[PDB]
Amino acid sequence: GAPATVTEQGEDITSKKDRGVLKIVKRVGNGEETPMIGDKVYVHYKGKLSNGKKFDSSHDRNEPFVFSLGKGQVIKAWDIGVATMKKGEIAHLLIKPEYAYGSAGSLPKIPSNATLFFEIELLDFKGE
Numbered sequence: 001g002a003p004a005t006v007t008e009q010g011e012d013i014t015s016k017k018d019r020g021v022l023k024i025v026k027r028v029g030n031g032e033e034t035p036m037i038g039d040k041v042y043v044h045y046k047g048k049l050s051n052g053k054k055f056d057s058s059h060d061r062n063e064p065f066v067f068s069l070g071k072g073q074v075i076k077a078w079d080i081g082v083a084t085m086k087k088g089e090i091a092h093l094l095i096k097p098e099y100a101y102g103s104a105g106s107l108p109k110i111p112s113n114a115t116l117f118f119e120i121e122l123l124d125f126k127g128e
């Protein structure tokens with residue numbers, strides 16, 4: 001399955017090189033430009049616990065997810081990962097709990113020490 005493929009073949013886009021954030025590009029985007037900190041970002045995503053019952057998606061509510069990149073308004077893995085993406089890129093991220101919700105987790109949806117997997121499509125990014 002997809003998490004497996006990322007474990008085995010995904011690249012470590014973390015600074016510390018601690019395999020906390022692994023990424024495969026599943027569909028290439030357009031241009032060479034990727035978003036700066038503070039840029040307004042527009043994405044679709046599907047997320048799940050790497051092995052678990054909780055599953056979440058923006059496609060479901062058919063509204064794009066919008067956040068300000070690099071400000072810690074999302075889990076750290078997203079600030080790291082989305083910054084490496086180009087407009088129109090779809091990527092797969094596998095994320096250790098240190099770059100996600102840690103030991104404390106976040107009920108109802110996230111257990112303790114949870115590894116997360118996301119498919120993310122980067123739709124657009126605009127200047128602050």
Ligand SMILES: COc1cc([C@@H](C(=O)N2CCCC[C@H]2C(=O)OCc2scnc2C)C2CCCCC2)cc(OC)c1OC
Binds near residue numbers: 048054056075
């Ligand atoms: C921590 O609680 C939540 C977490 C998420 C998802 C999640 O982890 N997300 C949502 C998309 C951005 C990445 C990450 C996150 O930072 O979510 C919390 C934030 S930060 C601003 N808005 C949200 C929902 C998880 C749900 C279970 C499968 C794995 C992804 C969505 C959630 O509902 C939208 C949510 O509670 C509101």
